[PDB]
Design a protein around this ligand. Structure first.
Ligand SMILES: C[S@@+](CC[C@H](N)C(=O)[O-])C[C@H]1O[C@@H](n2cnc3c(N)ncnc32)[C@H](O)[C@@H]1O
Lengths: 231, 998
């Protein structure tokens, strides 16, 4: 309804949220790397972060760094196609969805996996926060594999009462865990982004990551580092 | 710190043998619902809200919420403050919980559609689950039909309803058809039916035997959060984000198994959602629990309980009883309710009587004079009908109590009036009433007659000159004066003792046109208070003082919607209003903001009348060539068990400061305060100092968008701001006995962009003050508010840069007036405006002195100090100056969850230096939203979105955390503190309101 909804239509972005990933990369600069090659956008519908990924990695990059670059965006809902993006309609938990993502890279792990997914809030904060943690956990188990060791993982969070549990559940797996609002993130939203830098060592209807991170963690809370993002 | 009261999201309610048990934040509230008495509040969980509860026959309570579950004894909940030691935490979110059939185990449904069979210590005995891939649930219930027949009814996020048999772990049905996630599932008691609801806004009735969809109901206008069968599975009740409770009929036939049919719609909670519902089948009463913290009791038989609520008669029905006496095109044109029933008059002057006892109509008499556009009035309590016409004729008739015999009659004609277009009546004293008659000729008189209640004879006639723009619309009498409501929001007061005296004329009380009611409220000393309503929705409370008269407006407000036709106070002191919203008549409790009753009248609703009767009201109206009688009975139970507060975020809170003025003794045990919400309203209420119990007075609706700030700037002035540069100065009056009053004194000039914050400095004695506002576009404006001309003069404007400015504060040190802002870059920026404004600063307590110069718009000077403090936006800003007003310590809470403490100092040469004294980088887990200095700057209370309230101490410019405590108030975003005489009272706002003591 605001500024960014307006400038999203002016720039041909499918949603205002496109500026959250841009205003994010105005530092961390994880999309300004020439060596950056393979990215996965999880829960991408309707695809504005995948547009940003497309524009940064192809429209705005010398032909010299466009080789073997591959963008895969996944959602259970079907997405309108995006230039230079392979859109998969799959479940981030399902079988081959890691196998099929496996194949569209040269069995290479991704440099960077992002997710801007969130269900519509109900107004029940404890439910909304829990459901958001669910999405992050299930997203985390694909990122557990496909992510290149030492590669960044970005996700939208509900920065509420139990966020500090997520931070230390997430301590086992990253070098530097950061938390950021951008500035296109509405003041009236509990929104923030967990910008996980330097993928560190992972591990080695049944048991899932949410219950095995609940297994080890349990009932402990830590405070992640904070970082503003835009200019 | 100790928690005292809480008003906020109440997720569930249960009827239990004359009790209502309500999940209320992390507590259970037990009410005796016939008397609406709160028996006890017992905290069940440390921080989680109670999402669900159920009772065994033997008084055990099973309660769950998020990952918490507990089993607790009703007898303990009745008498103990807290039972949090019995709380257990499950590893997964708990979607539902039921006792086993014999109440020896409990069954816990997790969000992943696994059932944990536990013992009554909540320890798992074993687990049941289906085969296949996981399901994530947004809802579900376990329905116990018999010892071994337990159905798990799971509402998945993908929009299927999975019904499976618990002990055999066998799928019974996969009910598909919904379009969104399933937010509630329930089963009829007789095992015939499933009901589900989604965010597709539909309710679906399913055949539990065949698994077939039987009916789809579309009525709710937003997401549906809860539903259940009641009345022996013949009806369904649902409750929604749209704030309505809807009752449906299950209509069973042979040719279609059953279908849902909408029956009743009740609007019962504040914006927005309703979470809990339960029905007491015996009394046909429902209870609903809302995001607003309201618990509402609903008479499900409002239209049927006593059997005479609704009646209608066409002219043919009436003719069947009076005979074929009506002429072509003759219809009922007026009517009054008396003890015996209705007196009505036709367009041809036939006067008819309807007996409430016998249900019969009869012709009483014909007066051909009143076939010329008759008007009907009455004194209901004295059984006197008043008929007028457009030819200056009047007919008065008095009726016996039960008999309805004509016992007095009088008729007369007023030669002073050519044509007559309006007749009003009002009570005068024990022996007489008043009647006014007006004509459209500007030179003719406004005529007021004093008429005997005993024999309807004229005791005195008064003739007044009409002011220029005057058409009388309502009438009330007070002592020896008449207050005459008029068009254009005008009120004309005449003196019955001196018809040559110049009338007292109150012009333009509101933006509206027709004045619809004037009602005496209360008097004190030499002043009387009146409620004055306007058809266009505005109501004003005026104070009339005998010094010659003078007047002041004590209260102004606008109804949310529709025409406002009258208002009165009930015996509880609550302001009750009535009017129309397009075709719908409403009766509305404006003090506590809920509708009492509603009725579909004739769209145009040209002819209607409302009368008070013992145990309610009668509404009379003509709709579609029918005369309708609607009896509106007082509810068989209280309307609410809690009135509730806002149902959206509370962005600011302000307590009216203690004063030396004469605040009324009724308020002595507590404090008047305001809450300002994203629902765009300001609510003015009171809380008791000992109990933290909250009472509502008023919901002010001027603001168009969500509130940002409200602050009592002294004992009687309050400023609020929202967006669209809405900034309003309000004046509060707390001199009367039962309630405060508040009215707008002035709005700030407007240049879209928001007023993010403001601060004020008073000009010594004056009651004038300086105002600084900061905006989303980084602009800064300084204003002079002057009382006598009641206007804001712009005396300075400037800009910081282009980013948003979140907070601003005036700081007076020595002889300098400083402005401190906190832009979104995280800096503290100081301006010294002294040289550029026509005001001077007194060296101690920092008082402004007016130089009385002409208004020039100065430009804002360049900053004298710029200190980076936080790495992002600053959400909270506070300061305290030292005893010599040579320095101030500035406290900042950041969106970076850091807490900053800075020092602002002037040296001997008045040079400003701003240096940082301490910074706690991890002061909270999330955004710090409030940070206030208390105890002369020695302590700090902070609020943050992590729902942890923190108490701090400052020693040598250094902060240390000294206490912390969780609150249920989610999205914790506002804080207000008042000292008692030091012990403190904390008001904690977000989604909900909590009151604490420190
Ligand atoms: C807030 S939207 C994402 C916005 C998007 N990243 C953008 O910036 O334009 C949430 C998305 O999460 C997706 N989602 C939820 N659960 C999923 C799952 N299990 N597998 C794949 N996608 C899922 C939904 O389909 C929905 O499109």
């Amino acid at each position: 309804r605001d500024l960014y909804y307006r400038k999203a239509k002016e720039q041909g972005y499918r949603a205002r949220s496109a500026f959250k990933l841009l205003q994010l990369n105005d530092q961390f600069h994880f999309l300004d790397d020439p060596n950056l090659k393979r990215v996965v956008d999880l829960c991408a519908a309707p695809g504005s972060w995948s547009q940003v990924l497309s524009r940064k990695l192809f429209d705005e990059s010398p032909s010299s760094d466009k080789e073997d670059r591959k963008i895969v965006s996944v959602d259970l809902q079907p997405m309108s196609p995006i230039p230079h993006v392979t859109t998969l309609q799959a479940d981030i938990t399902h079988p081959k969805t890691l196998a099929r993502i496996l194949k569209l890279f040269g069995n290479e792990k991704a440099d960077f996996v992002c997710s801007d997914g969130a269900p519509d809030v109900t107004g029940l904060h404890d439910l909304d926060e829990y459901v958001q943690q669910q999405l992050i956990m299930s997203a985390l188990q694909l990122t557990a594999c496909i992510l290149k060791k030492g590669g960044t993982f970005v996700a939208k969070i509900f920065r509420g009462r139990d966020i500090d549990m997520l931070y230390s559940q997430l301590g086992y797996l990253f070098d530097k865990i950061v938390c950021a609002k951008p500035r296109s993130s509405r003041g009236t939203s509990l929104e923030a982004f967990i910008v996980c830098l330097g993928y560190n060592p992972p591990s080695n209807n049944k048991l899932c990551i949410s219950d095995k991170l609940s297994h080890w963690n349990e009932e402990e809370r830590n405070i992640a580092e904070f970082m503003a993002c835009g200019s | 710190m100790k928690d005292l009261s809480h008003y906020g999201p109440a997720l569930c309610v249960k009827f239990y043998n004359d009790y209502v048990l309500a999940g209320y934040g992390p507590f259970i509230h037990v009410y005796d619902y016939h008397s609406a008495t709160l028996i006890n509040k017992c905290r069940l969980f440390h921080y989680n809200k109670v999402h669900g509860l159920s009772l065994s026959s033997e008084g055990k309570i099973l309660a769950y919420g998020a990952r918490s579950v507990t089993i607790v004894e009703l007898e303990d909940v009745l008498k103990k403050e807290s039972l949090v030691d019995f709380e257990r935490i499950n590893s997964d979110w708990i979607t539902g919980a039921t006792f086993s059939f014999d109440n020896l185990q409990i069954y816990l449904l997790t969000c992943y559609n696994k059932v944990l069979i536990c013992d009554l210590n909540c320890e798992v005995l074993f687990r049941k689950s289906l085969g296949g891939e996981r399901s994530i649930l947004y809802s579900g219930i376990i329905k116990v039909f018999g010892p071994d027949k337990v159905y798990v009814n799971a509402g998945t996020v993908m929009g299927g309803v999975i019904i499976w048999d618990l002990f055999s772990e066998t799928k019974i049905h996969n009910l598909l058809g919904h379009e969104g996630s399933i937010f509630y599932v329930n089963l009829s008691n007789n095992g015939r039916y499933v009901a589900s609801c989604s965010d597709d806004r539909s309710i679906r009735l399913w055949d539990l035997e065949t698994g077939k969809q039987l009916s789809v109901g579309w009525s709710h206008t937003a997401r549906i959060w809860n539903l259940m069968f009641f009345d022996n599975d013949s009806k369904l009740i649902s409750v929604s984000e749209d704030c309505t409770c809807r009752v449906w009929n299950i209509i069973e036939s042979r040719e279609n198994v059953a279908e849902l049919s909408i029956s009743n719609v009740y609007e019962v909670h504040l914006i927005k959602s309703i979470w809990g519902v339960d029905v007491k089948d015996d009394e046909m009463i429902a209870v609903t629990s809302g995001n607003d913290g309201r618990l509402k009791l609903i008479d499900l038989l409002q239209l049927k309980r006593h059997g005479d609520e609704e009646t209608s008669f066409s002219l043919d029905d009436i003719a069947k009883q009076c005979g074929d006496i009506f002429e072509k095109n003759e219809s009922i044109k007026g009517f009054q309710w008396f003890s015996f029933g209705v007196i009505a008059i036709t367009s041809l002057g036939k006067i008819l009587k309807y007996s409430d006892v016998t249900k019969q109509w009869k012709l009483l008499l014909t007066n051909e004079k009143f076939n010329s556009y008759p008007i009907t009035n009455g004194i209901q309590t004295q059984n006197i009908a008043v008929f007028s016409n457009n030819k200056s004729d009047i007919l008065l008739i008095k009726f016996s109590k039960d008999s309805a015999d004509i016992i007095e009659t009088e008729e007369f004609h007023l030669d002073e009036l050519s044509k007559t277009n309006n007749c009003l009546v009002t009570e005068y004293d024990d022996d007489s009433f008043l009647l006014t008659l007006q004509s459209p000729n500007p030179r003719e008189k406004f005529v007021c007659l004093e008429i005997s209640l005993q024999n309807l004879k004229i005791k005195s006639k008064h003739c007044f000159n009409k002011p220029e723009n005057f058409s009388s619309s309502c009438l009330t009498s007070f002592r020896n004066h008449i207050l005459v409501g008029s068009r254009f929001s005008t009120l004309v007061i005449y003196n019955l003792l001196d018809e040559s005296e110049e009338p007292f004329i109150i012009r333009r009380l509101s933006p509206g046109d027709t004045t619809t009611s004037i009602e005496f409220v209360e008097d004190k000393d030499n002043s009387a208070v009146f409620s004055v309503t306007n058809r266009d929705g505005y109501y004003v409370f005026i104070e009339l003082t005998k010094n010659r008269l003078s007047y002041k407006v004590l209260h102004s407000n606008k109804m949310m919607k529709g025409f406002l036709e009258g208002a009165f106070f009930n015996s509880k002191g609550e302001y009750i209003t009535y009017g129309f919203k397009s075709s719908l008549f409403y009766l509305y409790n404006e003090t506590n903001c809920y509708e009492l009753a509603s009725e579909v009248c004739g769209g145009s609703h040209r002819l209607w009348n409302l009368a008070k009767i013992t145990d309610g009201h009668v509404l009379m109206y003509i709709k579609a060539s029918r005369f309708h009688l609607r009896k509106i009975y007082n509810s068989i139970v209280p309307e609410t068990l809690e009135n509730g507060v806002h149902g959206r975020e509370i962005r600011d809170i302000s307590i009216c400061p203690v004063s030396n003025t004469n605040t009324n003794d009724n308020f002595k045990d507590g404090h008047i305060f305001c809450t300002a919400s994203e629902d765009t309203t300001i609510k003015l209420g009171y809380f008791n100092n000992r109990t933290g119990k909250v009472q509502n007075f008023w919901t002010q609706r001027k603001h168009v968008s969500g509130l940002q700030r409200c602050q009592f700037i002294n004992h009687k002035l309050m400023i609020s701001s929202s967006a669209r540069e809405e900034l309003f100065l309000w004046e509060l009056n707390d001199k009367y006995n039962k309630r405060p009053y508040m009215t707008i004194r002035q709005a700030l000039p407007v240049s879209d962009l928001r007023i993010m914050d403001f601060d004020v400095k008073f000009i010594s004695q004056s009651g004038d003050f300086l105002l600084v506002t900061v905006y989303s576009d980084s602009t800064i404006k300084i204003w002079h508010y002057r009382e006598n001309q009641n206007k804001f003069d712009l005396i300075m404007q400037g800009r910081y840069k282009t980013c948003c400015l979140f907070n601003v504060v005036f700081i007076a040190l020595k002889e300098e007036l400083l402005v401190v802002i906190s832009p979104t870059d995280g800096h503290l920026v100081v301006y010294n405006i002294t040289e550029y404004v026509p005001f001077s600063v007194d060296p101690i307590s920092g008082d402004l002195v007016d130089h009385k110069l002409d208004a020039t718009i100065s430009n804002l000077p360049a900053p004298v100090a710029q200190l980076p403090v936080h790495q992002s936006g600053v959400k909270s800003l506070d300061y305290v100056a030292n005893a010599t007003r040579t320095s101030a310590t500035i406290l900042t809470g950041g969106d970076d969850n850091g807490l900053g403490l800075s020092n602002l100092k002037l040296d001997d040469s008045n040079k400003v230096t701003l240096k940082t004294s301490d910074f706690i980088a991890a002061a909270a887990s999330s955004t710090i939203t409030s940070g206030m200095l208390i105890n002369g700057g020695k302590e700090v209370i902070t609020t943050s979105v992590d729902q942890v309230i923190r108490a701090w101490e400052i020693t040598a410019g250094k902060l240390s955390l000294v206490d912390k405590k969780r609150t249920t108030v989610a999205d914790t975003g506002s804080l207000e503190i008042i000292s008692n005489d030091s012990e403190k009272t904390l008001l904690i706002g977000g989604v909900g309101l909590s009151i604490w003591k420190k």
